[PDB]
């Protein structure tokens, strides 16, 4: 499927980043496009992500309870 | 049921039910009171188009709801298609071929299993015929000439353009579904259709 690109929130954990993922969604009964945020824990053995950078989440083998993704880099076609 | 009942009541109330239950016109010695004086609610008018339809074919009213649901369910003029699903009813055809004088006469004439259709017997008056069918007597009916009595007294009115009566080999067939002009009874389709809008 797709990746889930999104900003890094706070990386005060080794090999671990929280990521806000912003997702538009049609609200069911009323027809707008409401955003919903959902933040994840991603893995990086390199841990080369500061606060505020934005990554892409890809499914991998689960590392902990929450850490079920590792994020590498977006493509960046502007 | 059948309603099996007093029937000049229904002819005086609904107007003359054509062919069904009489060729004799109503009130040969009657009607000498009961001024209507012109007050009739519109619901009474639409109700009298229900029962002008329901007694003329002898249907159960629940079965008439069934035919309206099929008539909506088909594509086209539901005011006409209701009078296609109630013309190609079998005992209406045996009435219309003159195989019986009245429609209870045809319904009873098909209850006691006197009609073969395409060589197979049909025991049920609510059978809906098709184009290009075959409607005959029973093999005993060349010895039981009740049908020939009905065909004897019948032929004042001829036939509508679906029927083809063969004189001695007693076979009647319908070329195609009956046209609205073809329908014998005179009534407004819209009045009946509007009435069932409520359900």
């Amino acid at each position: 499927m797709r990746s889930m690109q999104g900003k890094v929130i706070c990386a005060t954990n080794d090999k671990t980043v929280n990521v806000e993922v912003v997702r538009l969604a049609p609200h069911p009964k009323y027809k707008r496009r409401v955003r919903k945020k959902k933040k994840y824990q991603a893995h990086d053995p390199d841990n080369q992500f500061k606060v505020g950078d934005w990554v892409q989440l890809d499914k991998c083998r689960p590392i902990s309870k929450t850490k079920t993704f590792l994020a590498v880099a977006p493509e960046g076609r502007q | 049921s059948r309603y099996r009942g007093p029937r000049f009541k229904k002819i005086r109330r609904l107007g003359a039910l054509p062919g069904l239950t009489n060729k004799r016109p109503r009130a040969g010695s009657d009607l000498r009171n009961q001024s209507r004086s012109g007050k009739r609610s519109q619901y009474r008018i639409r109700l009298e188009e229900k029962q002008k339809l329901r007694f003329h074919y002898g249907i159960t009213e629940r079965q008439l709801l069934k035919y309206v649901r099929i008539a909506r369910k088909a594509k086209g003029s539901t005011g006409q298609v209701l009078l296609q699903l109630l013309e190609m009813r079998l005992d209406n055809i045996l009435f219309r071929l003159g195989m019986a004088p009245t429609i209870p006469g045809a319904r009873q004439l098909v209850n006691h299993r006197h009609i073969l259709v395409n060589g197979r017997i049909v025991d049920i008056p609510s059978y809906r015929c098709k184009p290009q069918d075959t409607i005959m007597a029973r093999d005993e009916q060349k010895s039981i000439a009740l049908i020939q009595n009905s065909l004897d007294l019948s032929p004042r009115e001829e036939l509508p353009k679906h029927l083809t009566l063969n004189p001695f080999p007693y076979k009647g067939l319908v070329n195609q579904i009956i046209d609205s002009k073809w329908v014998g009874l005179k009534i407004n389709e819209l009045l009946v259709v509007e009435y069932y809008s409520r359900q």
Binding site: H27, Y30, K31, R32, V34 | -
Partner: protein
């Protein structure tokens, strides 16, 4: 109520069709035990002596139910079968009592509309 945010919070919801019989609370009609068989009067425009049985039910409520028809057999501590339906004239009477059912006989000598009163055919 804009389409944006006063209404993808919520509009509001209507409550229910509010129950027009707080007892009978499973389903339609329920066995009863007679406690009082007294008689009360309607509101001001009418004038009658309407004869109601205050009845304990098998549900867990106690409720004053009307007794239809003309004659009534209902003494103290008999068993009835109440049903819903609001008698307007009486404040508090919410229910009826079925006639012709268990330990509440049919009405005396009625020949018009017997299925509402539990009287078998004559003739």
């Amino acid at each position: 109520m804009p389409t944006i945010k006063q209404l993808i919070r919520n509009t509001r919801q209507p409550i229910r069709n509010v129950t027009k019989s707080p007892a009978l609370r499973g389903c339609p009609q329920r066995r009863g035990t007679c406690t009082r068989v007294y008689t009360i009067t309607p509101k001001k425009p009418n004038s009658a002596l309407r004869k109601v049985a205050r009845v304990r039910l098998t549900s867990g409520f106690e409720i004053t139910a009307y007794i239809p028809g003309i004659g009534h057999n209902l003494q103290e501590h008999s068993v009835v079968l109440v049903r819903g339906g609001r008698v307007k004239d009486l404040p508090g009477v919410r229910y009826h009592i079925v006639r012709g059912t268990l330990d509440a006989v049919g009405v005396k000598d009625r020949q018009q509309g017997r299925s509402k009163y539990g009287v078998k055919k004559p003739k």
